[PDB]
Structure 1
């Protein structure tokens, strides 16, 4: 039913499932905006496919040819099925709009499924190629941040009663390499191109005259070519073509609204803001150097992933509340850190 389709595709965790494995425990591995874009671009065409053939919106068979009254039920069924299979056969049918509109009307669900698959492909390539590496690197970075926070609080407590910046060096090294950012931009660009092509196709499909679904059909090949009792042609109409056009314009609207989001996603350096690591600069055990901005490198992408999935880090949360309290400046950062006692 329509409501069942809605529950499956919008109100359920459709493509929102976290990786089912212990390797990525709590790691999104995909930005929220990218996940939203993929979920829409994939589950919208599927939802429209399901809707267009819902038991309520669908009168019945997808084509009716209006055989003569003399024709029996199965003769008329032969006519309808023959014309359905003959939309491909150009000789059989003669339609003013041509044969491409008939092809599109017959295979619209296939085309929507193709667009959905093509849009799901780049996210899958990301999740299967560049996701494990970033997951491992980000897990190491979070562990290092937790360890340095613990060491700093232990030092502060000892004072009240190595020291090498490994994480900073690793981030600096990531500043050079750009394979991950190149893959990310390539997959986003392919998604954008697929969306644009889908918009072109949907606009063309919705621009039809709405009468191209009606085509003339001739079961006059073979032994029936010279038969007399059979009329030279029939009036066939492809039902649900109006529904297809409505859903196609809906998908076109959604995709044109979505494309600016993908373009904004492509410009990762601009998105790289609100320095996540700036909060850690007040730790004595952490060097006061952010050095993450203004670069078409994997460093900006790692900064984005950190700003996305750093809320799960207790040390980061503690430092964030310390920073927020520092806005008033009533107290002292080391005193607040010592009082917090948030090792684990």
Structure 2
């Protein structure tokens, strides 16, 4: 059913949840915007692939060729089956031949875009997530220790953050991950725009069965009129995916500008502590860590208590 079809990918955490792997100690390894972009960019093509070929929008068949009435049912089944296979050939289907390729393999191409839009999230989850996750746990752990020793009166962190500032290996991976995702979406928009630009009267191709014995057989008609049934649904879903992508593309490029998103005063709330001195100019790992810090610094008890004092 369509309702349970959407339930698997939307209305429930398909890939929008923290993974059930007890190795990252329960932390957000992706930003809220990145997780939202990944879910929409990957979960929408999957939704549209299964929506297009649901048992409540389709008759059951995806191609239908009008055979002559003299043919038996199995002979007519042969024409429908042959012409479905006779889309990737040359000495037949004389109607082009490029839109017919796309119509037959449209669910595959959407799946290919789903794969290409999931790898950069997967590349980030291994090449850069465990390194940041281990660093994130240390930073949160030492901040609590600094708070505990400062409240017990009744700059190791500064040097460590400066060390991350000079290095820029992590931020390049993040930018490359976003750039790769943006390119695929831009490539997807070009394909979907081209696919939607295809005329509706293009799935009708003049197929023919003339090979081997059938060439010297003056019994079958020379040409068969076929119709790829699940095409108007494809073009309807292609523009919907295109509309979402051209709306999702500004979000991706906004994420690409890491330094502008962040604010350097995220850790400036720690200046209230007497044992904490004062602490962005380019594409550095400091900007990337601050964005990850901002997304999960609220979970520790030391930050919320300190932030309230800053609001006094």
- Superposition TM-score tier, normalisation by shorter sequence: over 0.9
Cα distance, 1:274 vs structure 2: 6.3
8 Å CA contact retained: 2:264, 2:290: no
8 Å CA contact retained: 2:38, 2:118: yes
SS of the aligned residue for 2:41 comes to helix
Cα distance, 1:155 vs structure 2: 1.1
Q: Once structures 1 and 2 are overlaid, which stretch shifts more, 97-106 or 14-23?
A: 14-23
In structure 2, distance between residues paired with 1:75 and 1:22: 58
Q: Once structures 1 and 2 are overlaid, which stretch shifts more, 265-274 or 209-218?
A: 265-274
Cα deviation, 1:84-126, whole Å, max 9, x if unaligned, reads: 00100121111xx710100000000000000000000001000
Tell me the number of residue pairs that the alignment of Structure 1 and Structure 2 aligns: 311
8 Å CA contact retained: 1:142, 1:313: yes
Cα deviation, 1:37-64, whole Å, max 9, x if unaligned, reads: 1111101001000000111101120001
8 Å CA contact retained: 1:282, 1:288: no
8 Å CA contact retained: 1:65, 1:235: yes
8 Å CA contact retained: 1:18, 1:28: yes
Cα distance, 1:168 vs structure 2: 1.0
Q: Which residue of 2 is the match for residue 68 of structure 1? A: 68
In structure 1, distance between residues paired with 2:106 and 2:197: 14
SS of the aligned residue for 1:236 comes to strand
In structure 2, distance between residues paired with 1:204 and 1:295: 38
Cα deviation, 1:207-244, whole Å, max 9, x if unaligned, reads: 01111100001101110012111000110000110000
8 Å CA contact retained: 1:15, 1:39: yes
8 Å CA contact retained: 1:188, 1:266: yes
Tell me which stretches of 4 or more aligned residues in structure 1 moved more than 4 Å: none
Answer yes or no: is 1:23 the counterpart of 2:41.
no
Structure number with bigger Rg? 1
Cα distance, 1:21 vs structure 2: 2.5
TM-score where L is the length of structure 1: 0.89
Cα deviation, 1:161-198, whole Å, max 9, x if unaligned, reads: xxxx1111100100000000000000100100000000
In structure 2, distance between residues paired with 1:18 and 1:264: 23
8 Å CA contact retained: 1:38, 1:123: yes
In structure 2, distance between residues paired with 1:47 and 1:275: 41
In structure 2, distance between residues paired with 1:31 and 1:13: 16
Cα distance, 1:288 vs structure 2: 2.6
Q: Which residue of 2 is the match for residue 140 of structure 1? A: 138
Cα deviation, 1:276-326, whole Å, max 9, x if unaligned, reads: 20111110122232xxx2221000000000000111110001011111xxx
CA RMSD between the two structures: 1.6
Structure 2: segments with no counterpart, 5+ residues? none
8 Å CA contact retained: 1:216, 1:236: yes
Cα deviation, 1:118-146, whole Å, max 9, x if unaligned, reads: 00000100001100000011110000100
Q: Which residue of 1 is the match for residue 77 of structure 2? A: 77
SS of the aligned residue for 1:54 comes to coil
8 Å CA contact retained: 1:151, 1:285: no
Q: Which residue of 1 is the match for residue 213 of structure 2? A: 223
